[PDB]
């Protein structure tokens, strides 16, 4: 109905699900994938 | 409305149960505490100040329940020891140790005439004990999973039981048979209180829901939302006008029976409160917790 688009337009979402999982700092995964490959070097 | 007395470091370890005597058998004058430190500290509330009368030991594990007789100046204590020790308070001496062996023991309750001793059991039975005998006279067998909370009707005509997952069982203690098996809760009930007229009944689960049930027709009089944590203990204001709520979040909300309103909240324990009891009229309110510090709340 008009109420649905009427509300979901005017509000805002600053807090979702997905960026909870993502960290507020910058933690890249190269270090993570480097040790991922390093344990594979033990394999 | 506030705190009158605060008892700093009243126990070595965390208190689990409280007993404040209501009558004039020198039990309004005293307090009984039950803790993890195996100390049953008899606290003489004399000259409106809290003095240690006795400290009772031998409960080799942490105390799960303490209570004071309505019709007698004696007391009784339980623990995980399954040795329900019976205590004389004028001397601070043990009357007997009721071995509820091997483990099958839980929280206790003085009868309104202080003759029968109800307790919970792992099997779901409710074992009734002779205060004179120390013997399991008969077990109120109502199947379930585990019995957690019980209360006598103070007028001495019913029993209610709170189980490990929200089973409410209504009994006629004159005949010891199950009247109603009420199921308003799903999560564990730790305390339940018959009304002073035994017309109502309070439930304290892990949901913060005080679901108040009628007794005489055994139906829901209303659900009351409480704290954020698990509400643990409850006592009626003995003039049947209020009831107090111990929770798991360092917070004690005080409730009206009718208007379902937090008429007051104390926050004074920095740790999780465990047990509550009023005055003989309900002005003083006693309160324990893991702070090992006992707070006495005047509430006019």
């Amino acid at each position: 109905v008009d109420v649905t688009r009427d509300i979901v337009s005017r509000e805002r979402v600053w807090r979702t699900r997905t960026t909870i999982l993502q960290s507020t700092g910058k933690n890249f995964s190269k270090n993570i994938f480097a040790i991922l490959q390093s344990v594979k070097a033990r394999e | 409305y506030g705190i009158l007395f605060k008892q700093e470091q009243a126990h070595d370890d965390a208190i689990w149960s409280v007993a404040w005597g209501t009558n004039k058998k020198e039990n309004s004058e005293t307090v009984v505490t039950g803790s993890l430190d195996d100390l049953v500290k008899v606290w003489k509330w004399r000259d409106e100040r809290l003095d240690l009368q006795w400290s009772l030991e031998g409960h080799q594990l942490g105390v799960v329940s303490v209570d004071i007789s309505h019709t007698l100046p004696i007391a009784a204590s339980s623990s995980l020891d399954a040795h329900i020790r019976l205590w004389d308070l004028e001397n601070g001496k043990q009357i007997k140790s009721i071995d509820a062996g091997p483990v099958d023991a839980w929280t206790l309750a003085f009868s309104p005439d202080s003759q029968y001793l109800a307790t919970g059991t792992h099997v779901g039975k409710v074992n009734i004990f002779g205060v004179e005998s120390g013997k399991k006279e008969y077990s109120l067998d109502t199947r379930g999973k585990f019995i957690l909370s019980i209360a006598y009707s103070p007028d001495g005509k019913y029993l209610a039981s709170g189980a490990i997952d929200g089973i409410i069982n209504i009994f006629d203690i004159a005949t010891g048979k199950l009247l109603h098996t009420l199921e308003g809760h799903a999560m564990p009930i730790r305390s339940l209180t018959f009304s002073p007229d035994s017309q109502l009944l309070v439930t304290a689960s892990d949901d913060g829901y005080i679901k108040i049930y009628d007794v005489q027709h055994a139906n829901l009089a209303g659900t009351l939302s409480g704290h954020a944590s698990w509400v643990l203990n409850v006592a009626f204001c003995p003039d049947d006008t209020h009831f107090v709520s111990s929770s798991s979040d360092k917070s004690v909300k005080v409730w009206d029976v009718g208007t379902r309103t937090c008429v007051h909240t104390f926050f004074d324990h920095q740790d999780q409160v465990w047990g509550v009891k009023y005055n003989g009229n309900g002005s003083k309110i006693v309160s324990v917790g893991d702070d090992q510090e006992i707070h006495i709340y005047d509430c006019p």
């Binding site: 109905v1 109420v3 649905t4 009427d6 509300i7 005017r10 805002r12 600053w14 699900r17 997905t18 999982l21 993502q22 960290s23 507020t24 700092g25 910058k26 933690n27 890249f28 995964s29 190269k30 270090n31 993570i32 994938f33 040790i35 991922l36 390093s38 344990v39 | 370890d13 965390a14 689990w16 993890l36 080799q60 594990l61 942490g62 995980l80 020891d81 399954a82 062996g101 091997p102 483990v103 839980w106 792992h122 999973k145 585990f146 490990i164 799903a186 999560m187 564990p188 949901d207 913060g208 829901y209 659900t223 009351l224 939302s225 409480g226 954020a228 944590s229 698990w230 798991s248 893991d290």
Partner: protein, 459 residues
């Protein structure tokens, strides 16, 4: 957005009759620091009063209450929502601006606030007021469901959740919450492939949240005796594949890296685990899981004095006074004195709220056995404590008997209490040996106090 920040602090110090300048200040500040948004709204409340004494439009006041919701200012957040609804009522004729719809979302926020008050009664009231007038809305339809989820799963919780999919099967949040219900039923583990496949339609993909849920339901499969059968090895590598996938699509997810470290720790690389958990540790400490998983490594180096403190640090959340698995994961190789008697006290705390557990009553019997054999063998110890020793081992034998009569165990039968029974019998013999030694030390302390009595008479 950065240029927006620059322009906003190009105009904030200025005033070319700034009116909305604080509005579009805070309008980007809601992602950022909330206090900046508060300050912007603060002088924005004022700025609508001097040019003309004009009441603040309720969209502002609702949003500042929304800010205080994530702050500690819950009460005046409630006052903001009340006066917001009043100002929307003061928007008597503004169905162009749709003050009614603004009141709808304001009431949604206020019901969410009543949930923060734990005033679930009034939360129910506001929610059913909105749904009886706008049943097309879903979030109110499921927060009600979430409220009954706090009571339990098979309530109308689960049914509001399913009808939220019935009104909107495209809705990924509710659809995720469907399987979130099924997380309670872990026996519905392998069945969750289907109930987390339904919106693996690629309109919903990519859904990091759901695919991490796949990784999590795939990791709970682990710690089974079938790893040697290559089955949990395949499961470990499959979870690893999920974690590589979420790794490539997001380097900055932290629950992912927790998953990688967990699966490699299950692969026995615990020196290779504290590092990867250290990363998410600086990333955010406020993840309850990583506190546990680090201390598991610590006790794997037997670093108890680094572990149990961080256990009780995990206990510093306002969640549960006796969490069970945390004190389980606490009492693992606890071998020192406080690792024995205060270990017993922790077990008693757990037992107080959990007397149903067979494992816990076994473990108290174990620790009582340990402290009993700590006081009777090279000891030569006090009268009173060895008097308590016989009672406590008697109790331990009562539990040895009691558990052994019970059938169901932790999928490992506890007939191991039988060798504890032969032990406690020979402990009875040892106690009868050493209680005589207790009487000996009593009589010699009597004779030496006689020896001091005579010499003090001499003085």
């Amino acid at each position: 957005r950065d240029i927006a920040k620059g322009h906003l602090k190009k105009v904030t110090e200025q005033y070319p009759d700034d009116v909305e300048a604080w509005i579009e200040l805070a309008q980007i500040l809601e992602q950022t620091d909330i206090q900046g948004a508060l300050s912007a709204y603060g002088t924005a409340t004022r700025i609508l009063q001097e040019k003309v004494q004009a009441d603040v439009p309720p969209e502002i006041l609702n949003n500042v209450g929304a800010l205080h919701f994530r702050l500690g200012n819950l009460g005046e957040a409630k006052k903001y929502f009340l006066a917001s609804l009043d100002r929307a009522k003061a928007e008597a004729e503004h169905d162009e601006h749709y003050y009614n719809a603004i009141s709808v979302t304001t009431s949604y926020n206020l019901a969410r606030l009543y949930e923060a008050m734990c005033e679930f009664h009034e939360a129910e009231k506001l929610y059913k007021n909105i749904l009886r007038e706008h049943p097309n809305y879903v979030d109110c339809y499921l927060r009600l469901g979430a409220m009954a989820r706090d009571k339990g799963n098979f309530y109308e919780a689960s049914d509001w959740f399913k009808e939220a999919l019935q009104i909107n099967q495209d809705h990924p949040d509710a659809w995720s919450l469907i399987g979130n219900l099924h997380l309670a039923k872990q026996e519905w583990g392998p069945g969750q492939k289907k109930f987390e496949r339904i919106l693996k339609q690629p309109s919903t993909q990519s859904d990091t949240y759901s695919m991490l849920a796949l990784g999590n339901v795939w990791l709970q499969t682990l710690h089974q005796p079938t790893r040697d059968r290559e089955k949990e090895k395949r499961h470990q590598d499959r979870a690893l594949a999920i974690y590589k996938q979420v790794l490539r699509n997001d380097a900055k997810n932290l629950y992912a890296a927790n998953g990688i470290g967990a699966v490699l720790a299950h692969k026995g690389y615990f020196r290779e685990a504290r590092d990867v958990f250290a990363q998410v540790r600086e990333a955010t400490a406020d993840i309850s899981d990583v506190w546990l998983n680090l201390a598991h490594i610590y006790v794997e180096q037997k670093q108890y004095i680094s572990a149990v403190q961080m256990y009780e640090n995990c206990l510093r959340k306002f969640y549960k006074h006796q969490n069970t698995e945390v004190v389980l994961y606490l009492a693992r190789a606890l071998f020192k004195c406080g690792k024995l008697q205060e270990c017993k006290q922790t077990l008693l705390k757990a037992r107080h709220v959990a007397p149903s557990d067979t494992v816990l009553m076994f473990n108290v019997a174990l620790v009582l056995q340990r402290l009993a054999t700590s006081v009777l063998k090279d000891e030569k110890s006090n009268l009173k404590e060895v008097l308590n020793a016989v009672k406590e081992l008697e109790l331990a034998h009562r539990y040895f008997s009691y558990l052994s009569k019970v059938g169901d165990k932790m999928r490992f039968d506890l007939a191991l209490a039988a060798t504890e029974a032969r032990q406690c019998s020979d402990l009875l013999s040892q106690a009868q040996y050493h209680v005589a030694r207790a009487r000996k030390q009593d009589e010699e302390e009597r004779e030496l106090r006689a020896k001091q009595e005579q010499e003090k008479e001499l003085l």
